[PDB]
Paper text:
Using IS21 as a model transposase system, we show how an ATPase regulator uses nucleotide-controlled assembly and DNA deformation to enable structure-based site selectivity, transposase recruitment, and activation and integration. The IstA transposase possess two helix-turn-helix (HTH) DNA-binding domains, a DDE catalytic motif and a β-barrel followed by a flexible carboxy-terminal region. IstB, similar to the MuB and TnsC helper proteins, is a member of the AAA+ family and a close paralogue of the DnaC/I helicase loader. However, this tetramer state is inactive and requires the regulatory IstB factor to perform transposition.
Author numbering:
A (entry chain N), B (entry chain M), C (entry chain K): 0 to 246
D (entry chain F): 186 to 246
């Protein structure tokens, strides 16, 4: 018959969506007056909606983000320090085209990681590659790669991504070996792709964090040559929410 | 708008052929008021036909076929030795299901290669994986694979194909090393995939061909445990063509 | 200044010939006020002629041509067997397009190798690559290639040329190993490039010449599938010249 | 083969049967030899300190 062959071809073209959407659009058009061009337009619309959903899901699967969140979920009234103008300018991702690195600084609990994650999610939705990793985990990966001889592969897969998000930079102290690994990463990403980083320590403390003043100076120079820093301060949202739950 | 979005959708689906073909079939549907189900059926039919044609061309490209030829361009009258019944049975490709090795024997010029290449072309068209190689080339490939340490990769690429067409087996004498390489290939293809072979020497001569009588006996037993050999004899097609051109 | 810069630019463009050609064409134009287009055409045409002559000389040097001889310096009256029509048809090089092998057979002294060498020189002049070699030397070279492991290199350099002129095929008897080497050479050039051969033995004797009847049959079939044979008979030109010198 | 089921063969070796494939450089041929030989065979696996070494030790002491 016709339906079975239609489904066969749809699956052969990798379009079970086509089998599903053709049913719906065909029913709608038989119950309406849809010119064949418009019927096909609706067909392609459904196909690409489902295809884009699957592509975004696959990209998130490849991505190693901590959790899913959106900028709209971020409230600015509770954090007057942040400015919606600059946040939305970042949301437009014009900084990526300008090769500008984003740095978040301030005491923990404010919610900088939320903004970083939201920017990463928007980049993924728009199609730009985005990868996430913590400073400790990234250092562990680089050290293991050097030990096993797969350093080149890990450097390639960490430099290729359009956006890289280093997190928890400052909580854990770094030995000079980890300092040189981080310097390698930064130098590979000097003026090639933006870096989104979050930290709780001032730039000066990085010297003791990496165990080498000169390496810290070089990394800071390269990072801050083209970057934007948000020095956010306020109240630890975790503690504030705990108090609200108590009351 | 509509048409640009449609084109973007079609190219996202990786089907520019679909993009251009839905235009023709949608115009046809409007010109004759074709049902939506039949319209999609036409779209899918044309797209599948083009996809399958491109896949067949790609498969032929990947296979190292020296030349393309079909049983249609074959003479069954000038060669009484061949029987059209058995040739058509081979064309049915029942040997693949029944795991039968197809072998052709006879002096040079008869055309044993033509039937084998036609069967390989039919197998490729139907979707079966078929690969072609000469005994000299196969021995060279095995020796180089052993030398370079990628013996496993070349053994895999020679064994995985559903049909392996070994050609020019007998014109070139083989040493015991090449004998053991060929023995490895045969053992890997013992009862896993049919083998198509062409030769001009009797089975007894294989002992001198491989430089080791016991290896020849073992290979002959392995190959002929499940085999069907066409011993063709008669006038050489090359000589007949030369005579016809002369007259 | 001007002249030194002109010479430097001509040498940088690798056109010292063009440097001397303008040294003459400029004077010629000054004597007749030639148009700039015609002046440049003179320069370019002279440069092209000189470069083509040098390239032809280099091609002659690279090819193992024992001596240069042209069909013009060849009298057909002393050899009634040769028909000027067929000789000039060969000179047209139509066989190259048709991939027809040319064979010259007959008793020594007639001058078959003269025609072979003339065709080789014509091929060099017209751009068709030609390589002239003796059967003994070819066999020795193939054996050396097999011994040293560069068999692929020697087969490549002996198959790439558009024309291969095998000479002295029949004077020296060949062992079966040399027979297989010659068979490899023929097979690589089965339907890829014309072959020009000169011999003094009938096709039947080739079985004893190569020490293998089946190999002889296969090689003869491959050689004569697309070929034009010239079995010349008559008095030896060397003997006639000796008689003329005596008288 | 010539002395198989026709006359006994007395052979002394120091390698297991499997190693004969490497010893002769032909696994199939070595396996054939072993199969034909073992069809009528008696095996003697001798284990002990080398009598040459023990005699040398006794001479030393
Ligand atoms: N505007 C906001 N709206 C809702 N929740 C918020 C907001 N800002 C911060 N939070 C809360 O803060 C926590 C997120 O902390 P986040 O990791 O983003 O910040 P941080 O200061 O980098 O953290 P860390 O303590 O790990 O160093 C979550 O509990 C989130 O609910
Ligand atoms: N019956 C036939 N009808 C049409 N073409 C044929 C027939 N037999 C052979 N040919 C063609 O004649 C040419 C010579 O045949 P082919 O080389 O395949 O035969 P062969 O005996 O396997 O050759 P060889 O042993 O010399 O390599 C090839 O183009 C083959 O396709
Ligand atoms: N028609 C001719 N006009 C002028 N010179 C000729 C003619 N025929 C032959 N010669 C010359 O006679 C000599 C013999 O020619 P060539 O060696 O090519 O003959 P051949 O029959 O192929 O020889 P062989 O079988 O002895 O190797 C060469 O110098 C050739 O130039
Ligand atoms: Mg954080
Ligand atoms: Mg063949
Ligand atoms: Mg000669």
């Amino acid at each position: 018959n016709m339906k079975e062959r239609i489904h066969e071809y749809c699956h052969r073209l990798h379009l079970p969506v086509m089998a599903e959407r053709w049913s719906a659009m065909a029913e709608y058009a038989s119950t309406h007056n849809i010119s064949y061009s418009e019927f096909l337009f609706r067909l392609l619309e459904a196909e690409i909606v489902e295809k884009q959903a699957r592509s975004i899901q696959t990209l998130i699967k490849l991505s190693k983000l901590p959790y899913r969140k959106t900028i709209d979920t971020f409230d600015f009234t509770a954090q007057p320090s942040v400015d919606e103008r600059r946040i939305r300018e970042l949301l437009t991702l014009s900084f990526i085209d300008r090769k500008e690195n984003i740095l978040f600084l301030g005491p923990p609990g404010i919610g900088k990681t939320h903004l970083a994650i939201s920017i990463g999610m928007e980049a993924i939705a728009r199609g730009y590659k985005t990868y996430f990793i913590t400073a400790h985990d990234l250092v562990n990966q680089l050290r293991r790669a050097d030990q096993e001889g797969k350093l080149e592969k890990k450097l390639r897969v960490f430099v290729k991504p359009t956006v890289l998000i280093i997190d928890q930079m400052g909580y854990l102290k770094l030995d000079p070996n980890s300092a040189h690994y981080l310097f390698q990463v930064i130098a590979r990403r000097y003026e090639h792709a933006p870096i989104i980083l979050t930290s709780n320590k001032s730039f000066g403390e990085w010297g003791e964090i990496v165990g080498d003043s000169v390496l810290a100076t070089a990394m800071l120079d390269r990072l801050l040559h083209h970057s934007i820093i948000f020095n956010l301060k306020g109240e630890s949202y975790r503690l504030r929410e705990k108090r609200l739950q108590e009351e």
